[PDB]
């Protein structure tokens, strides 16, 4: 039914309403911020990063350089010199305090909704000159864009942006400088971000001034029927609708603003064997330098191998309530173990991986050329490629946790399946009574949400649009 | 020079070409030809491995326009695309058609809702139709864009054909168990509800028509002044009330509710798909699975189905997905005794 | 208290309620299993 | 209990029937 229709005619009363929706969004960040802090795990960043807890907000606070907590807990791990005077802890109080102020005010333009005060205007009480509002609000927004990119991001004021290298974890927040050419025009060089806002900030400044001064020719009032709000609504709905589909891909594909240790990996890195690759080059490189296979693996940093476990690719999960990754694998604590499956003649067998598309895969072992050697038969009767008939063997030359060798066919087999998931790990299943089923990362969640919403705002754009331009038709 | 065009252009002829008339026709024409052209003349086995057209002899059903190769991701390979290099023939060999059809065709849908807005401000009618039309457009983007985006590439998007669509269906049943999704369920609700309405409304009318309105007693007449129209709400009401038990009798509601059911449905269904785009599904019942593994004398239809799926997946994925190159040894395949 | 920009009358009828509840319960029914499991 | 809840929401959908079909607002021609 219709009820919020009543606010269409009154500005001061509608600025109250708009105040509360804004007051709740500030009080939500508190709930969220606070909730996350009480839940988050500090113990180990390398194998149990925020994207594994299922922490949502945390990521964006980090993104712009908030790393401390009044209690010492920092994501970089280095706390010997951490005194962020206003960190997560304090950021929480910020939004809640803000939520509070905005709230109270709302009440006093809702009770005091007249235009008879200590003000200087351009407006007649029963009107709002839109094209002027725009220019005014615009210029002051464009000014922001400017600062955020110029001072904030460049280190002029310290909250540099967060940076990361291609693979690993060597990323800490450092000032970011923009390179205006093309190299930094794509979405990966943070220079594209910084440069942007600076440029767009300036254009906003200008565009503002020139939207404040010239007035609507005849398109605004005659064509886009802009005497009433309605249009400002449809106009903007399609803008956000557009942004929601941009962020959504930004998130899912990955951009300079969608780093790794903040939201986890991508499906594109799994289908791309992007990790397996770097990992390999770290072995043929070191191996050729006079080390033993055992030695090389034991060399490649583990976080790198973690990024390789499939459970870290947004896999499955329409409905899996708490859906933190951990009630899936469990809490990971393990090694960068490479399982080498050799045969009875010593040939090195290669296992086929499971495509993020399947919920279950058939354990199969291939030769280095693509030949089929071992498999785990379903119909054991006329089996020919069994594991026992051909005798396989698993030998672990990996991170500390497991530098040995195995024979039994029951044991050997187990790993084959756990191999199919890429790297092999051990999880503290019992702490959360994990069920052992996969779950999804904040990326999938952030996407599924924001894409649907956006899709959902398309109706919103078209409803309010037509309803704007057919006043008389609406009435019939 | 402007307004003139407005009018010349918006001139009320046989086929109304409005301002939107420029998007609609160039796009809705090429999107049709694009189909019909490849359907009749192109092969897509360089990209998919199967037979695409009539040129190779498929029946109407079999023939279709197949999706690009998975090796290409989401590169819109237009004729001047760095990949096709301007060579038409190959631009077709590679499937550069799909993209053609979906893009032009996406705008034809844009034009058609626009043309639905025009006509409402010239005639002075309500825009509602233009809004009911969003459902299909949702379904469309949901399907052919959002979904392929979320996944490995263009390949996995429905294929432009008949059978090529049935294969889509099945695909979904195996890897997603889309039937268990609640969203597809509601979608399934409106579509069947749309047809249930269409029958009762159309039959009630026709059958409650005013007696003797035609001496000859056939029913091919009306007029403008025929304000009252040919039938009774009072009798329908009682008819239903005493047969079904309920009957909101207020013509204006009856018709609107007829907008709500179908359309409300497809929006869900489309939502449901934005979900699968991210392999986020409703393919499991933890509760059951758990007791399903700790105990072997317990089975429900929930389970029996999950079995068929794996069968779909094992047998259908090596021929259906040429790029990974699946090699599956006879024994390995799941298989019920004797079959 | 003394402002007239608002049309202050909110109404839902008997019938609208029936359909309202019929939707929430049915809707609830369906989803029930999903929240639960 | 997973049960009673599927039953509970059931008894209501039948209670709503009775009440909708036998206690509805009249469709009158007094107009």
């Amino acid at each position: 039914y219709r009820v919020h229709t009543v606010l269409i005619n009154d500005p001061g009363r509608l600025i109250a309403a708009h105040l509360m929706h804004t007051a709740l969004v500030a009080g939500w960040a508190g709930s969220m911020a606070l909730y996350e802090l009480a839940t988050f795990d500090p113990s180990d960043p390398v194998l149990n990063p925020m994207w594994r807890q299922g922490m949502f907000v945390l990521p964006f606070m980090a993104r712009l350089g908030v790393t401390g907590s009044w209690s010492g807990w920092s994501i970089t791990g280095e706390t010997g010199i951490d005194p962020g005077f206003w960190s997560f802890e304090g950021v929480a109080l910020a939004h809640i305090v803000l939520s509070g102020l905005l709230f109270l005010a709302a009440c006093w333009h809702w009770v005091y909704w007249d235009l008879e005060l200590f003000r200087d205007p351009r407006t007649g009480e029963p009107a709002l000159d839109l094209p002027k509002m725009f220019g005014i609000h615009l210029f002051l927004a464009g000014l922001l864009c400017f600062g955020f990119g110029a001072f904030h991001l460049t280190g002029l004021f310290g909250p540099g942006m967060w940076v990361s290298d291609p693979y690993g974890l060597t990323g800490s927040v450092q000032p970011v400088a923009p390179e205006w050419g093309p190299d930094g025009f794509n979405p990966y060089n943070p220079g594209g971000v910084v440069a942007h806002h600076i440029a767009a900030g300036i254009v906003g400044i200008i565009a503002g001034l020139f939207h404040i001064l010239v007035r609507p020719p005849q398109r605004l009032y005659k064509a886009l029927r802009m005497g009433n709000i309605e249009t400002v609504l449809s106009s903007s709905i399609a803008a956000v609708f557009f942004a929601a589909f941009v962020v959504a891909g930004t998130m899912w594909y990955g951009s300079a603003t969608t780093p790794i240790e903040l939201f986890g990996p991508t499906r594109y890195q799994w289908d791309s064997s992007y990790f397996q690759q770097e990992i390999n080059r770290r072995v043929q490189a070191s191996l050729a330098s006079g080390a033993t296979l055992e030695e090389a693996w034991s060399a490649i940093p583990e976080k790198l191998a973690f990024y390789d476990y499939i459970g870290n690719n947004p896999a499955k999960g329409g409905l899996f309530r708490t859906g933190p990754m951990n009630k899936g694998d469990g809490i990971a604590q393990a090694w960068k173990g490479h399982a080498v499956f050799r045969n009875k003649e010593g040939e090195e067998l290669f296992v086929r991986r499971m495509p993020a598309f399947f919920e279950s895969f058939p354990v199969i072992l291939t030769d280095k050329n693509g030949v089929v050697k071992a498999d785990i038969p379903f119909r054991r009767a006329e089996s020919k490629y069994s594991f026992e008939q051909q005798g396989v063997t698993v030998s672990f030359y990996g991170g500390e946790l497991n530098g040995q060798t195995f024979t039994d066919p029951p044991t050997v087999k187990s790993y084959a399946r756990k191999a199919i998931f890429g790297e092999i790990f051990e999880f503290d299943t019992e702490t959360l009574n994990s069920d052992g089923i996969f779950r999804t990362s904040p990326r999938g969640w952030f996407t599924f949400a924001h894409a649907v919403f956006a899709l959902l705002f398309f109706f919103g754009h078209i409803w309010h649009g037509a309803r704007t331009l057919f006043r008389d038709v609406f009435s019939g | 020079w402007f307004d003139i065009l407005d009018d010349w252009l918006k001139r009320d002829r046989f086929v109304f070409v409005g301002w939107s008339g420029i998007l609609l026709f160039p796009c809705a024409y090429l999107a049709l030809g694009g189909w019909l052209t490849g359907t009749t003349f192109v092969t897509s086995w360089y990209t998919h491995g199967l037979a695409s057209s009539y040129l190779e002899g498929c029946n109407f059903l079999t023939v279709a326009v197949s999706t690009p190769a998975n090796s290409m991701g989401h590169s819109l390979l237009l004729l001047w695309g760095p990949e096709a290099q301007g060579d038409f023939t190959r631009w077709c060999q590679l499937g550069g058609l799909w993209t053609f059809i979906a893009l032009h065709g996406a705008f034809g849908l844009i034009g058609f809702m626009l043309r639905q807005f025009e006509i409402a401000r010239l005639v002075g009618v309500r825009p509602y139709n233009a809004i009911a039309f969003s459902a299909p457009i949702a379904v469309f983007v949901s399907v052919f864009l959002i979904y392929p985006l979320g996944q490995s590439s263009w390949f996995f998007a429905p294929s432009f054909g008949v059978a090529a669509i049935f294969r889509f269906l099945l695909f979904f049943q195996g890897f997603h168990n889309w039937t268990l999704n609640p969203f597809h369920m509601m979608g399934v609700a409106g579509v069947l509800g749309g047809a249930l309405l269409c029958a009762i409304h159309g039959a009630t009318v026709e059958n409650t028509l005013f007696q003797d309105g035609e001496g000859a007693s056939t029913f091919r007449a009306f007029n403008p002044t025929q304000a009252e129209e040919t039938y009774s709400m009072v009798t329908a009401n009682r008819f239903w009330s005493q047969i079904f038990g309920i009957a909101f009798s207020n013509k204006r509601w009856l018709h609107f509710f007829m907008l709500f059911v179908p359309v409300t449905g497809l929006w869900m269904s489309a939502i449901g798909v934005v979900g699968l785009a991210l392999n986020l599904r409703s393919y499991d019942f933890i509760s059951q699975e758990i007791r399903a593994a700790e105990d072997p004398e317990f089975e429900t239809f929930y389970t029996k189905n999950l079995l068929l799926n794996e069968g779909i997946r094992a047998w259908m994925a090596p021929q259906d997905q040429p790029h990974e190159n699946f090699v599956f040894p006879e024994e390995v395949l799941p298989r019920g005794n004797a079959l | 208290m003394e402002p007239n920009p608002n049309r202050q009358p909110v109404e839902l009828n008997r019938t609208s309620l029936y359909l309202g509840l019929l939707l929430i319960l049915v809707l609830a029914l369906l989803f029930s299993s999903y929240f639960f499991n | 209990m997973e049960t009673i809840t599927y039953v509970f929401i059931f008894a209501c959908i039948i209670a709503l029937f009775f009440f909708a079909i036998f206690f509805r607002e009249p469709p009158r021609i007094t107009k």
Binding site: - | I286, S287, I290 | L12, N13, R14, I24, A28, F31 | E2
Partner: peptide, 30 residues
């Protein structure tokens, strides 16, 4: 069996809020 007990609270509130809601409005109506 094993079910997430939060479902109950979820599924109960789904039943009540929108319902309560409408219950308030059908009284103001009369």
């Amino acid at each position: 069996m094993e079910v997430n007990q939060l479902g109950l609270i979820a599924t109960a509130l789904f039943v009540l809020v929108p319902s309560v809601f409408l219950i308030i409005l059908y009284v103001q109506t009369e």
